[PDB]
Design a protein around this ligand. Structure first.
Ligand code: CA
Length: 191
């Protein structure tokens, strides 16, 4: 039950739970997943159930992959809790390192233009059509959003985006933060 300490020490301010509460959640988690592991498909099922207004399978896959760039295998309880926090709790500004891992689809250490499009598209599919019509014209399709992000970083099509640059830009340029925003409720709310 002391997988809770490293969850807390990894999330810190990000956390919505105490060690005791995490242990309670864990005990319940073990009743459904006694191995303490869940697969990509099982993780996707969680998002499919709780975002019925959206098409969350791609998003949930990228979130699952954020930790290791691997669609195979599993998350442990720690990674599952962190993932739910990342998509659903706290402030985007406390998640920037994790956001880099999300956007670096292949895990090679830099973000490419295509990776931005892939992730932006997956996030876009988390938005209901009823909300999409309220987006600014120049941010109302995945291609427009992804190209705006790339332009804000000053990039040519074949350039690579490093973690240093990503963190600087998402901190400093709040338009970049708005466009890379991956929490579905926050995209909805600033919209
Ligand atoms: Ca990459």
């Amino acid at each position: 039950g002391a997988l809770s300490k490293e969850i807390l020490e990894e999330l810190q301010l990000n956390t919505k739970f105490t060690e005791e509460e995490l242990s309670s959640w864990y005990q319940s988690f073990l009743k459904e997943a006694p191995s303490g592991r869940i697969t990509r498909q099982e993780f996707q099922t969680i998002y499919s159930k709780f975002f019925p207004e959206a098409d969350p399978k791609a998003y949930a896959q990228h979130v699952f992959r954020s930790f290791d760039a691997n669609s195979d295998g599993t998350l442990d309880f720690k990674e599952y809790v962190i993932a739910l926090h990342m998509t659903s709790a706290g402030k985007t500004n406390q998640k920037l390192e994790w956001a880099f891992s999300l956007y670096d689809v292949d895990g090679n250490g830099t973000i490419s233009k295509n990776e931005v499009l892939e992730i932006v598209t997956a996030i876009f599919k988390m938005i209901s059509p009823e909300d999409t019509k309220h987006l600014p014209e120049d941010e109302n399709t995945p291609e427009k959003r992804a190209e705006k992000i790339w332009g804000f970083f000053g990039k040519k099509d074949d350039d690579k985006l490093t973690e240093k640059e990503f963190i600087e830009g998402t901190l400093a340029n709040k338009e970049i933060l708005r466009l890379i925003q991956f929490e579905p409720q926050k995209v909805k709310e600033k919209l």
